């Protein structure tokens with residue numbers, strides 16, 4: 001386990017013949033209101049475009065997933081709500097340890113008057129994506145699929 | 154766009170204050186048979202465990218997503234089938250450009266007599282995960298959600 005680089009949000013290490021990128025854990029928040037899902041968009045230098053995502057962010061020191069979920073929802077959309085843990089996933093275990101904890105937010109309230117808030121029906125997000133109009137982040141796709149599977153009724 | 158490292162499956166670069174990891178595109182295959190989903194497991198050094206995933210892999214030079222999907226299904230499970238493109242997603246656009254193209258495989262046939270083949274009902278995979286018994290890769294979770302949303306009827 002030798003380190004070739006230690007950065008702000010990631011470290012580059014070598015474990016045998018395996019190239020490994022250590023990355024802080026993350027959270028993502030799925031929120032539905034009046035049939036629209038709360039997506040967010042922002043320029044992502046890594047991909048040169050703004051994919052459709054859902055409120056998300058890295059967990060800060062001393063913070064647990066639930067608290068991070070609350071903070072990101074508030075900082076990115078100015079909203080607060082009743083959060084429930086859903087499930088988690090490793091974004092790409094073949095090379096990084098980034099783990100994302102996904103939450104559901106209900107009974108949204110505006111607590112606060114670079115990130116674009118994009119309320120959109122999940123059916124419309126899926127269609128636009130299928131048309132090649134917009135790209136998805138893993139969190140955005142997860143939100144869309146979760147909705148079609150458990151939030152239509 | 155300065156490069157600090159050029160490896161086998163990734164490059165570490167710096168674009169201003171942004172740390173960016175270039176990574177080859179990937180494919181993932183969702184396959185259902187007799188109510189069971191085709192998951193695979195393998196030791197992942199990056200996370201120190203074997204999460205539940207679906208057949209997946211990196212696209213090789215001269216290969217397009219569909220062809221890569223065919224190859225990975227065959228190499229990891231010894232099966233072939235009729236593939237249909239579903240959608241794509243960036244695994245974590247906040248730091249890497251890895252993009253995953255997801256396909257659906259139907260009418261599976263065994264063409265060939267480190268990776269463990271795990272046929273499991275998606276409902277069971279979700280339950281085990283909820284119990285903290287198993288972890289998910291983004292591809293594994295996507296497969297589970299996709300099934301609950303569009304493959305139950």
Ligand SMILES: Nc1ncnc2c1ncn2[C@@H]1O[C@H](COP(=O)(O)OP(=O)(O)OC[C@H]2O[C@@H](O)[C@H](O)[C@@H]2O)[C@@H](O)[C@H]1O
Nearest residue numbers: 017018019020092093094095161162179180209210211253
């Ligand atoms: N961290 C790593 N560093 C260097 N080489 C690696 C690493 N992980 C795997 N490899 C090499 O790459 C080959 C595997 O290639 P793939 O077909 O692409 O499959 P794999 O990466 O192991 O899993 C596929 C899927 O999970 C995701 O994490 C990944 O991005 C891909 O979508 C193997 O022979 C192995 O030697």
Ligand SMILES: Nc1ncnc2c1ncn2[C@@H]1O[C@H](COP(=O)(O)OP(=O)(O)OC[C@H]2O[C@@H](O)[C@H](O)[C@@H]2O)[C@@H](O)[C@H]1O
Nearest residue numbers: 008009026027056057058100170171172173245246247248
């Ligand atoms: N590639 C990068 N390199 C260095 N710093 C970065 C990078 N990308 C963002 N940042 C810094 O981190 C802060 C953003 O922190 P987060 O709250 O974690 O949100 P962000 O990473 O931008 O998007 C959140 C979600 O998308 C995923 O890609 C990510 O892993 C997370 O789950 C910003 O103030 C910014 O300066």
Ligand SMILES: [Zn+2]
Nearest residue numbers: 056057072075
């Ligand atoms: Zn944030």
Ligand SMILES: [Zn+2]
Nearest residue numbers: 058059060061
């Ligand atoms: Zn921070």
Ligand SMILES: [Zn+2]
Nearest residue numbers: 209210225228
């Ligand atoms: Zn492979």
Ligand SMILES: [Zn+2]
Nearest residue numbers: 211212213214
């Ligand atoms: Zn290869």
